[PDB]
Symmetry: C2
Subunit: 113 residues, 2 copies
């Protein structure tokens, strides 16, 4: 019958993000280093720009080194880079104000505040 | 006490953004040559989506020339799949797309739908 068919993968995007996270954790095929409180986080500039307006501004014109200022803490940032790369944001009484602030600062998209 | 949120759309937003960078030619790092046509992409995404690109990328400005088995008619829908999750097949393109999936070893495509067209 069929002249056309639109095949749709329900697993593909989750799989891309998983592979990008695996790249990140193994430090393979990354292209940016973020410095937070003197701690080095490896990442992909495309993914950071996708997930955050702040990173988008600091990346789009441009290896790359980005220093986040003292308002950004590791306790606040670490869960957000994990969100960026996993779709899962784990918050606790301990980290929630630091995370909340760092979402305003980095302008991280798609987080129900 | 803890709240853990899991977005089922988040990975689909990131891929949308990456597709938009790709179309604008912003933040890309590899150029693919197919039939003398130039396709800009992200090496990380091609590696994630294809064993062939993974081998050509992992230890490596990056230029990747696909051989004459790879055609634009076969390739274009697959680079679009890789960045959208949607593969549009037609009686015209389906054999070319199918061969190019075998050649590139593109992940996450149910091969049984080639048979519909």
């Amino acid at each position: 019958s069929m002249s056309v068919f639109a095949y749709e993968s329900s697993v593909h995007s989750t799989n891309v993000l998983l592979s990008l996270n695996d790249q990140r954790k193994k430090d393979v095929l990354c292209d940016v280093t973020i410095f937070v409180e003197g701690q080095r986080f490896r990442a992909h500039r495309s993914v950071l720009a996708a997930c955050s307006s702040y990173f988008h501004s600091r990346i789009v014109g441009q290896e790359l080194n980005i220093t986040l200022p003292e308002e950004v803490t590791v306790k606040g940032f670490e869960p957000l880079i994990q969100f960026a790369y996993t779709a899962k944001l784990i918050l606790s009484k301990e980290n929630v104000d630091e995370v909340c602030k760092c979402v305003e600062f980095l302008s991280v998209h798609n987080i129900e505040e």
